[PDB]
Design a protein around this ligand. Structure first.
Ligand SMILES: [Cl-]
Ligand SMILES: [Zn+2]
Ligand SMILES: [Zn+2]
Ligand SMILES: [Zn+2]
Lengths: 595, 594, 595
């Protein structure tokens, strides 16, 4: 019955295709399967996971601070594909390489592999459990820290949630396998980060408080975000119990000359170690990383070569090659970086359907300040609205919109707000002057932000815009969550357990709390189709070719051999019959003809 | 009759397609590049300066200039790396004025030499001279820069000295101000003839090609002293500018800080830095070079930057903005020009490679940015697509076997051929040089080892050379020194009789470099007319049924052409295209090549 | 402008196809050639004789003639049965001279009336008068024969007497020498007006008695020998110059011929003319019997359009008679040559071929006219009754009997058709149809017949059926035309002439009177498209192939050379442009894209 379920899924995608791939491009028919590198044989040298375990978070931080080598964080398992491949990368390909990281690059600080779009996308678009993924990575790399990006007021959700819910998620994330939480707030508002950070500490894990970088500190024309801005925030975040301070350059804006300044300054402002995350949209982020290294930053992020560049992180292989031999040499085998990268390359070719059209670096990023992770996404949305040939006007509108909102920090989900605004502005051919003129029906998201739902920026919201937009509704300036009733967690669990006619795990409950509808759908899908996550990627998105033989591991130990022998015409009752051979035995599966 | 000829070409590509595009991808059916509306006359720039100061003194001016000077490679190295050099005069010339008006403070435009000379005739049916002339006319305030191949010129082989000398005279007359001359084995003796010619024509940018790693004591062959000595040698040989041509994109930031401090101490000449962004960090190196005092650096427009190209011009500039060494270039204008190039690029969908981003692997194979895609496609051809990384490894091993050489055109082709065979025939280095395995080496490898591409500092590996040369005695003198001076008058009579007409000096120059390509091109020109005047889509794809086109045959005069209908193929194997030219019916018959 | 018009027609058919051919079969992708004739002038024939003798004395001449006289139906009844009357003037006119030169001994050419008049305008965009005129010009030594419908003329309804009269005057002026007038219910009182008109035009009045039932079957006494002989004596008294036996359904069996013809010759001094159809596959036997028994003149179609629902084979009936006392005296090699032409002509009309595969004795059961048979079969398929065709046939027999055993020919046969079809569709028996229960809504045509519109049969209409069908309306039994007001011919001409904004010819007016709407439409078509009739048949139905060269004669002498050089894609204004070369000169014609 687990196999029967799988056979049904396979029968379905074989006959109807996967909705996410049905009309996008296919992978080159050649299709050289990704091969996990054969590893030497030895056991695993202890790494940071062991260290944090022995030292606790406060003392681990002090260890990073004092470490001479630069520490590296690989974002391939998360930010890399979230930017390049619409986060569509599957547990099957991610889990399979965790052990090779463990054995080959034990000196890595952490693996960014959870949070961001992954939580929601995995259930919604890949029919797989984000928890199962974390568990598998954990099991494969028990010597490295596992890192997530955590969204502060939302957690990993899409809305605001009562505090106990955020608190509950964090406890589960920790239990689940996460060691290092990079928590950020879209308006860099410390008051809105407190609940989160407290929760991370209470779980005795690493609280990496992030300051989001925007504007230009070396540009006196734009004083709103100067050096003092960040250093103060660092002091504030330290006082709020951070173990690590992080500079989250979501749009890839930090320029090398600024890095030299910003990182000298931050190390002087706080005893806490500093962690630098950036994006390579400019095509110069590596310069910035290296500057930050030279200027004494403690840890930086990079992606594997085969998923680096552009809206991703800059190239991990080359940053390492640059640092090799130097006093701050990170101590990582390039042959191994290369071999893992080749794996990633082969893995990537499977995801052809989710490649964007971006051709290379763009200094335009310094104008629009679109997050690397929003860029493609907003471009596709622009095509949707029939604006493909005005994309640069969209970009300009975004810049203008930003300034109109008072020059805000643009990241999830504030950057979505500016997006929506820009798109409307071009569609409806409205200027800023037009927008704030004394009739516009503003986007739901803009109304919401201005009401106060995404928090408050340092100088508040522009009075005039806000009045016009809110159209009567009185705006608030307290912490958004402070106004939401504490959730009755027991009743809300009863709700899901009745709907699914069974008990759920704490993790499943956590998922439900963040994404009630997506989770519900996924649970139902699961009951129907079985543990589809065990299928290799091609089979998952494309089913099986006529004649094709597939090996699929249903339950560790047990391997099913499945052959697509034949596919019937569509019968009077609208059904197609796929003729399989499961482990040498005939099986006939009926699925509906969805066409 | 010029119109009749164009109508024939259009009719032919409409019915048969262009061979270069017929089976590659098409551009998104949506779609045109629009030249930015510019505000004034043109502020004087470097072209004026060189005119007043001469080359020696111009160099001194660069040396003393505080701002960093920028060279745009978009018109040459950018598309040679990204689009198989298939970029057309039509799109290149149209923007030259916008450069002239909008970015006058630019040092130069790299827009000639390299693959462009040969590819433009061979694959684009256009005169490389007409192109240079048009750029010249559009940007009379900027220096025009070419990459010149030293012993070959722009050719594919070695040539007698007078022939090299002749080309350079014409190149200068043609409009080129700045010659970046290089030699594939960094052999100064092999550069001398070229440099002397450039000087005789009154800017000689002598290039040292960067390879290995100076800050790696494990690889001493190419240490700091290597380069500084070459600089002192090249200065003594009459260079006006010293250039670091990092063809493979190997120079790492920590090395830039060292190398550029050292070079400026080694020579009074100004330094010019060219690199490729294969690593995905070349921008870091550029900026390092700028901080360490380099005089001038190369970058491509954003829309044609990255990867095997130059690093992003737009962002390097944004990074330097506000700093003491600020290059002084309007970013809004950089962005706007880039937007044009982006729209220009989408036309060339057929020539896009599959390369997805940065690769630190570059530090292993050391393949020039400009050879990389090309060698990958060749690898697929030989059915090795799925062993590309073994090809890369073989290339690294081959390099070492040849004694660790400088790999650039055409030495890099030699290592390429070698690696490919090695993988095909499943041979190790041990195998290649075994006294037991009969190996038939590539023509190119036999040639290099005989001495045809010159001599590396430590000569050729005795054992390999003996086995490869298979009897033939090798030489170590300068290759050109052995070629008989060409009787330029007789050789001109040859082409002029064959083409049944006089040729211009530039045409003769073309013929000398590429006898067969030129011949073909001339013949094509007589048949098809000035195809270069056609916009890019029309050129590669003809006209759609019903489609209206505007084409400017002779500046002033504009033709309006409509494809009204296309016949079935007749008994005599011909298709008839029904045009409307300026409101008059015209019927053009072309053969059905299918 | 005549040429421009033709070019437009050619452009239109080329791009849109002909509606009548667009979806039927095409002819084999692999031209008819008019036989080269010796070179002599034309021997005088019957046309000269009638001219010299007048109609009364011409008949006496036929009576006394020893050879059997032949009438070729290929130009009319042949293709009306086999090809839905779709045969074009172009093909018909071209051979008329070959008849004239090669078979001068022929009595007549049936080439007008029946379906031809109406179909030629409606489906072939051509003037039936232009045709008659062209035939006349080609064969000035043979009699031209029409089948004239008595009460209708050539129309589809009843008309006032003056109108009938007017048509006949024109018909005669047009070129017709021999009128075979018939009445669907064999009602002489309904023929009188017509016959009187023919005589007043000093032309041959062939009065037809329609054959039905079986004279040698005592089980069916309604139509016995006395029936026909009396009719003959009646029609002789009514001024006929010739009696004709019109066996529309091909019912007359040989044994009966021997009897009926002996008898008729004894009943009247007038000469007898025998028309039949070969649906039984034995009509030739009956013809030959009629000859042996002394009939004066018989009908046959050319070999290539003979058999089945057509006339029996002219070639073979002649070969049979060759050498005998009554030998018709016609060159068989010439019959064969003309027949080969018809064969090549026929392949052009592939679109109009039926699916009939050969003889059917079933004809003795349903008594469907040869000319109605395919037509009713196609209509049956329309109504979704393809697989019940034999039930249809049976219903027709039953319906006939229900109506009291009527003579089934145009348009009474149409009435029986309509009844049968409903009977099968609605699954009603005769008992059902006449039940004082089942509420039946009878066909308009059945209501009409029973009211009295198609005249009165010898024994009147069945009381019970008539009451039920007429649903209140009082029925009449006077002559239908007698109740129609004499038409004010002058006003009615003003009507057409204003509508067409021009004078019309008498012939045109005649056409209008018979078929107001069809003619109107044709006149408008003519203004648009020019003399399309001059175009060869393939070109007419199918336009011109890419590259194809065509010769068309616009005005005798002048020949146009037309080449289809190219065809454009459809432009924004929905138009397609065809590129012609007319006599060496470029021409561009725009037609709408009807698809
Ligand atoms: Cl009508
Ligand atoms: Zn990021
Ligand atoms: Zn280059
Ligand atoms: Zn008949």
């Amino acid at each position: 019955d687990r196999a029967t379920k799988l056979l049904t899924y396979l029968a379905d995608v074989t006959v109807n295709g996967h909705p996410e791939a049905k009309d996008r491009p296919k992978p080159l028919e050649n299709a050289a399967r990704p091969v996990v590198p054969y590893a030497n044989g030895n056991g695993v040298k202890d790494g940071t996971k062991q260290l944090l375990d022995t030292l606790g978070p406060k003392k681990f931080g002090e260890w990073m601070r004092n470490e001479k080598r630069v520490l590296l964080t690989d974002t391939t398992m998360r930010d890399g594909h979230q930017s390049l491949l619409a986060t569509r990368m599957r547990t099957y390909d991610i889990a399979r390489i965790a052990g090779t990281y463990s054995h080959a690059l034990p000196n890595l600080l952490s693996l960014e592999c959870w949070g961001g779009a992954t939580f929601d996308v995995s259930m919604r678009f890949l029919t797989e459990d984000p928890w199962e993924r974390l568990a598998l990575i954990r099991e494969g790399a028990p010597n490295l820290l596992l890192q997530m990006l955590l969204r502060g007021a939302n957690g990993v959700g899409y809305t605001n949630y009562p505090d106990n819910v955020v608190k509950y998620f964090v406890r589960q994330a920790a239990k689940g396998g996460i060691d290092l939480f990079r928590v950020f707030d879209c308006l860099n508002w410390v008051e809105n980060m407190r609940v989160s950070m407290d929760a991370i500490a209470e779980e005795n894990k690493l609280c990496e408080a992030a300051i989001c970088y925007t504007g230009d500190i070396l540009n006196s024309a734009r004083p709103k975000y100067d050096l003092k801005y960040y250093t103060n925030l660092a002091v504030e975040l330290e006082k709020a119990g951070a173990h690590i301070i992080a500079v989250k350059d979501m749009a890839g804006l930090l320029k090398p000359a600024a890095a030299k300044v910003l990182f000298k300054a931050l190390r002087e402002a706080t005893g806490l170690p500093i962690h630098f995350h950036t994006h390579d949209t400019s095509g110069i982020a590596a310069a910035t990383v290296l500057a930050a290294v030279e200027a004494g930053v403690d840890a930086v992020d990079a992606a594997m070569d085969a998923l680096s560049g552009n809206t991703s992180q800059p190239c991990l292989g080359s940053i390492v090659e640059a640092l090799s031999g130097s006093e701050r040499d990170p101590g990582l085998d390039p042959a191994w970086i290369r071999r893992i990268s080749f794996y990633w390359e082969a893995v990537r070719n499977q995801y052809a359907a989710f490649e964007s059209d971006l051709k290379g670096p763009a200094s335009e990023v310094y104008l629009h300040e679109m997050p690397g992770g929003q860029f493609t996404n907003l471009k596709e949305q622009a095509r949707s609205l029939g604006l493909e040939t005005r994309w640069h006007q969209v970009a300009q509108a975004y810049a203008d919109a930003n300034q109109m909102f008072g020059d805000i920090v643009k990241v999830t989900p504030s950057s979505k707000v500016v997006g929506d605004m820009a798109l409307m502005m071009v569609s409806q051919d409205l200027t800023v002057a037009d927008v704030v003129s004394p009739e516009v029906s503003f986007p739901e998201s803009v109304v919401s932000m201005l009401k106060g739902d995404l928090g408050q920026p340092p100088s508040g919201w522009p009075e005039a815009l806000q009045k016009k937009a809110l159209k009567g509704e009185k705006p608030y300036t307290v912490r958004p969550g402070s106004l939401l009733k504490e959730a009755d967690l027991d009743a809300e669990r009863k709700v899901i357990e009745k709907k699914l006619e069974r008990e759920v795990s704490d993790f499943e409950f956590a998922s439900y709390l963040m994404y009630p509808k997506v989770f519900t759908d996924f649970a139902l899908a699961s009951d129907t189709y079985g543990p589809v996550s065990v299928l290799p990627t091609p089979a998952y998105f494309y089913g099986l070719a006529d004649g094709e033989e597939l090996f699929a591991d249903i339950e560790k130990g047990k391997t099913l051999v499945i052959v697509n022998q034949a596919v019937s015409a569509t019968d009077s009752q609208g059904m197609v019959t796929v003729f399989f051979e499961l482990n040498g035995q005939p099986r006939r599966i009926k699925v509906p003809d969805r066409a």
